Amino acid sequence: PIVNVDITLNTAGTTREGFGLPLFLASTDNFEERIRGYTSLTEVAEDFDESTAAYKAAKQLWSQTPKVTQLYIGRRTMQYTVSIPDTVAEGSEYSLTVAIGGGVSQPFQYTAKENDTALIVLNEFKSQIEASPTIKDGVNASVTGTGASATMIITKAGDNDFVKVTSITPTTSIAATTADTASAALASIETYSTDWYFISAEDRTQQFVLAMASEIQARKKIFFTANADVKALQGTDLTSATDVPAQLAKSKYTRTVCLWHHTAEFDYPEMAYIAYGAPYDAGSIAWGNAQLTGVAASLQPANQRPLISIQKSALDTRSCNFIDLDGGVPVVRRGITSGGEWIDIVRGVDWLESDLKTSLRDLLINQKGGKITYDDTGITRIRQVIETSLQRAVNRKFLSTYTVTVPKASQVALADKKARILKDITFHGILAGAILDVDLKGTVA
Amino acid sequence: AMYQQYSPKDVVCSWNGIAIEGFAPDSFLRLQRTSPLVTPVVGAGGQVALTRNADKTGTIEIELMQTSLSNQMLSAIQAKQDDMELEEDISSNFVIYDPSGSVLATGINAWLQELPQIELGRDQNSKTWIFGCEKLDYTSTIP
């Protein structure tokens, strides 16, 4: 049709592209892959229900003025413990339907009866599963059982990285728990893709969070977490505190951000904090005095009233983040990571690298016609590209000055020139601060 | 007693990720700020009040041999930049590598300003490219 005009009654939303994309490690096997990207809340709703933690995190992410272009959802390897608590003839005692990777289903049928206990029927199910030639290759079974208890633990064995044994009917008392540490989950996630920057996890156990932050600190990514532990508000001396927000400060994990909000576990408020600065260019933003839409102040666990100054002081001593109530406006405060480093500084440092890498890759890839000779000319071109990247940083008002030092062609050993590599280039930068608080006096006479 | 040697063959100028090679026989680089540092205002009574200028812009003029290859690598760069939108950056740091310390400045956010004037003749005439700058920083070896 000459002019195809469509008019809808939906409000317009703005989408902005910043530095980095969020990743959310969940614990649901709704999808078979490890990482799946979503571009809106509606797409998330197609694979997740309103009661799932992933949907809650996605909803929190997309409640900001910009949109954050994309969101990645990560899947943890989850085990299952099948129980029986009944042991009554055959009835049905079945429909286990161990899915396993690839796309097989090979469901299960009524095992047995005639003086058969949960132990017998579960062992029969294990034997039947091992007998089938589409699941035994990649799925391992272990009937600990230990008598009446009858615990039937199932897990992926080999290449098949997907396992799902959801069973209808009250006959089978299935369970679903994650069976990987932070290292296994992170390695599995990174084996798929590594183009994500912000990471948050559904799991809120102290051990998993501590290990996850420990492994993130060694990498070039930022781990966002939330907490609602009352013990975080009580103590002020560090050595004394031994809760999740405390050891993070003690361990000096500059690459993790902890936001104490009363709506932890149940909800995930840190996704909104991610969306506050995700769509804006790294370094040019100030993460401190942030206003989040639809997120209330950090209410007290007991009286459900904003925290008193003592609790805020305790959280500050723990290098956490809280949603302060300045005159009735809920503002995230101190915008800092566990370890004293500002969020914007860490993000800007990561962005500089990403930008230096991109600029030098652009210089060193597009040389199709010829070569960059190892004489002074090539070193000068490389130095110019480095200085251009640093000037791009400065024009953004992240840095103020910079110096670049590169080696001469005669001071590079033959061992390097052979491997056609250039080493020991150094550069320095001076940051420019931002103002977040004001000190005032007064006379009035 | 003796100052640093000045070897013009070791001077390398690089802009926009390429190296500008091949220099004119006589004069091949000229850096100049467009405005003086200060301009004193002398009152009718003889008093003097300085005015510290805020404009650090400079112009970089570089001369290459008539048949140099760079002349045809900057032309291609300029042709590509013309087709660009406004929102894309057309400027980059003008870097000069001089071990003699003869040159003092590095062009900050330098951009291409004037195309060379092509002149042919029984003899060879160099081509003069003109670059701009945002702030012609005079650096010093002395810390």
Numbering used by the authors:
A (entry chain A): 4 to 448
B (entry chain B): 2 to 144
What did the article's authors report about this structure?
Bacteriophage Sf14 infects the human pathogen Shigella flexneri. Here, we report multiple high-resolution structures of the full Sf14 particle, including symmetric and asymmetric reconstructions of the virion capsid, empty capsid, portal region, tail, and baseplate. Sf14 virions have a spherical icosahedral capsid of 820 Å in diameter, which is connected to a long, contractile tail that is approximately 1205 Å long and an average of 235 Å in diameter, expanding to 315 Å at the baseplate. Overall, phage Sf14 appears to share some similarities to other model phages, but in different combinations: both λ- and T4-like decoration proteins, HK97-like capsid and portal proteins, T4/Mu-like tail fibers, a Mu-like baseplate, and a P2-like tail needle.
